[PDB]
Design a protein around this ligand. Structure first.
Ligand SMILES: O=C(O)c1ccc(NS(=O)(=O)c2ccc(N3C(=O)c4ccccc4C3=O)cc2)cc1
Ligand SMILES: CCCCCCCCCCCCC/C=C/[C@H](O)[C@H](N)CO
Lengths: 34, 278
C-alpha cells in the first residue's frame, strides 16, 4: 500500500496499474599461452 | 613392453603457463603431449611398445659369416679342406649397425649354423653324406694347421658335429666378456707407447682391445674325400638373447669401412630436397 521512506519520512502511493505510470524512485603477466 | 598413457580431454586454455615455449639450451627434451597445444578428446590408448624392447629389437638371427670349406683330395692345392673364421659381428653390416646403436651390451648368444653343399663337377662320381666339424678355438688354444691334425681331437674345445641334411646346428653361450659388458666402441689402445721406445714398439691399432678377444671357429669336412670335389658353405647366424644395452649412440650413417669407425666412401647420404618443398 503506502510506502514510507526516509528523506523526516515521506509517503509514496502508486495510483496506477502500470509500473510505467510510477514516479521515479531514487533508490608473470608478460608470458601467456592461449 | 608397457602400455601407453591415455589421451585426456583438454579444452580451451587461457593462462600464463606456456608449455609450448621452452629452452633446448638446457639439453632436455620438452615432454609435451597433444593436449598441451591443441584441444584433445579422451582416447583410451591400446597400443603398446612390446616390439621395440631391446630384446625384441635384437631377437633375430642375423648372418655374420659365410665360411667356405671343401671336401677334395689333399693333393689338390687349390682346395681348402678347413677354414678358420675369427668370431665377430663386424664381417656383415646389419647386425653390426643394430648393435652399434649402443655403446655397451651384455647378452647371451645363440649361434645357428646353416650348412649347404654342392658338387663342383659332374665327371668324377658322387658323394656320401658329409659330416662337418665346427670346433670353437678359444684364444690361446692351438689353431688347426691341417684338416686332420691333432687339434681336431677337441678334447677340451667344444665341437659340434653336424650331419648334412639335418636341421641347422645350434648352440648357445652365456655372456663371456672379461669386462662387465661388451664394448661396441673402445676409445683407446692395447698399449701405451713409452718415451724412448723405438718406433716399432708400443704401437697398437686404435680402438682394438685384444688381438684375439673371442677366438675362432675352425670348420672342416670330417669325411675323407670322394673322387669328386664338393664345396660347402657354413652360414653363421648370431642371435643376442637376454640383451641389456647402455649409452645409446647415433646409428651409422655412411658405409662401414673396416672394424673401426673409419669412413672412406659414401659420405653424401642425404639426398636433395627443397626447403619449401613438401
Ligand atoms: O648369403 C648370404 O646370407 C649373404 C649374402 C650376402 C651378404 N653380404 S655381402 O656383402 O655379399 C658379404 C659376402 C661375404 C662375406 N663373407 C665372406 O666372404 C667370408 C669369408 C670367411 C668368413 C666370413 C665371411 C663373410 O662374412 C661377407 C659379406 C651377406 C650374407
Ligand atoms: C661353437 C661355440 C662357439 C662359441 C663362441 C663364443 C664367442 C662369443 C662371442 C660373442 C660376441 C660378442 C660381440 C663382440 C663384443 C665387442 O666387439 C668386443 N668387446 C670388442 O672387440
Amino acid at each position: 500500500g503506502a510506502q514510507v521512506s526516509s528523506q523526516i519520512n515521506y509517503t509514496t502511493i502508486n495510483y496506477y496499474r502500470d509500473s510505467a505510470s510510477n514516479a521515479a524512485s531514487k533508490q608473470s603477466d608478460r608470458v601467456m599461452q592461449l | 613392453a608397457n602400455n601407453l598413457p591415455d589421451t585426456q580431454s583438454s579444452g580451451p586454455a587461457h593462462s600464463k603457463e606456456t608449455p609450448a615455449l621452452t629452452a633446448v639450451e638446457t639439453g632436455a627434451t620438452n615432454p609435451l603431449v597433444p593436449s598441451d597445444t591443441v584441444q584433445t578428446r579422451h582416447v583410451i590408448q591400446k597400443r603398446t611398445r612390446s616390439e621395440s624392447t631391446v630384446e625384441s629389437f635384437f631377437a633375430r638371427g642375423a648372418c655374420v659369416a659365410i665360411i667356405e670349406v671343401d671336401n677334395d683330395a689333399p693333393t689338390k692345392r687349390a682346395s681348402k679342406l678347413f677354414s678358420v673364421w675369427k668370431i665377430t659381428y663386424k664381417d656383415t653390416v646389419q647386425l653390426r649397425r643394430k648393435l652399434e646403436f649402443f655403446t655397451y651390451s651384455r647378452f647371451d648368444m645363440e649361434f645357428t649354423f646353416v650348412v649347404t653343399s654342392n658338387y663342383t663337377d659332374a665327371n668324377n662320381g658322387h658323394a656320401l653324406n658329409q659330416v662337418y666339424q665346427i670346433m670353437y678355438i678359444p684364444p690361446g688354444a692351438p689353431i688347426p694347421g691341417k684338416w686332420n691334425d691333432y687339434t681336431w681331437q677337441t678334447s677340451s674345445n667344444p665341437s659340434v658335429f653336424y650331419t648334412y641334411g639335418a636341421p641347422p646346428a645350434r648352440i648357445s653361450v652365456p655372456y663371456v666378456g672379461i669386462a662387465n659388458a661388451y664394448s661396441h666402441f673402445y676409445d683407446g689402445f692395447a698399449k701405451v707407447p713409452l718415451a724412448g721406445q723405438a718406433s716399432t714398439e708400443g704401437d697398437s691399432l686404435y680402438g682394438a682391445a685384444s688381438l684375439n678377444d673371442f677366438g675362432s671357429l675352425a670348420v672342416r669336412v670330417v669325411n675323407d674325400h670322394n673322387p669328386t670335389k664338393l664345396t660347402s658353405k657354413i652360414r653363421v647366424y648370431m642371435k643376442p638373447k637376454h640383451v641389456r644395452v647402455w649409452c645409446p649412440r647415433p646409428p651409422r650413417a655412411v658405409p662401414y669401412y673396416g672394424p673401426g669407425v673409419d669412413y672412406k666412401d659414401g659420405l653424401a647420404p642425404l639426398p636433395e630436397k627443397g626447403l619449401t618443398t613438401y
